[PDB]
Design a protein around this ligand. Structure first.
Ligand SMILES: [Cl-]
Ligand SMILES: [Zn+2]
Ligand SMILES: [Zn+2]
Lengths: 29, 21, 27, 21, 29, 27, 21, 21, 27, 21, 29, 21
């Protein structure tokens, strides 16, 4: 897996792929 | 939070998975 | 319509729309 | 859910913000 | 809505979502 | 083919292809 | 239009630049 | 232009909408 | 399913998954 | 190939890394 | 065509579009 | 490599095409 900074929509999409059917929470606050 | 851990710092796949449901 | 690709577009769109308040993605 | 409402029809940003926190 | 810098394809996609059926013009010059 | 998702990909592609000269998106 | 020409068939970058300004 | 307003500066949804058709 | 759009999503996903080791895309 | 395996069904990251170098 | 820095998934997608049926190799090492 | 040429420096369409198959 990539070893780098992931930000914004890129981070969100990464969570999407990695979490799969579990889904995820995106709480950037 | 996820921004400090994975956007300002680098996250592993496991750290990234801490934010799954 | 492949639900998975649509999902990708949906979480991007929700990133923009929700901004600070964020969202939960629960298929 | 968001997938059924928005994957066959187009959802606007106003309909999409229903699914925000 | 997000309060942040939007650039390149990210800005374009944001316009896409926000403008909807009106469409938009992308004139970055 | 869901025209909206395709549209998303299309405006990204046009971003790259058109570059400086830009484009108008008018569904 | 671009949607009909390019959403069922693949458009190359050369066909896509038709739709630039 | 849109780059100076929304990429170098931050735009609101209304400023962003100034660039719709 | 339009194979081309799916392909777009696939090469993004492979970017993330493969990281350093990279990949070959050969339709 | 990746297109047939993954464009009709969902591939996980574990199935996707099969296609890495 | 755009004259600018292309990085990460953006660079990859650019290769996707530009290379078409030839495909491409993404070797960032 | 492609990162030095097109991400740290700018690539033309031809330089970018050096990385097609
Ligand atoms: Cl799609
Ligand atoms: Zn980006
Ligand atoms: Zn798509």
């Amino acid at each position: 897996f990539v070893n780098q900074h992931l930000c914004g929509s890129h981070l969100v999409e990464a969570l999407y792929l990695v979490c799969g059917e579990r889904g995820f929470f995106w709480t950037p606050a | 939070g996820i921004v400090e851990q994975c956007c300002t710092s680098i996250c592993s796949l496991y750290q990234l998975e801490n934010y799954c449901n």
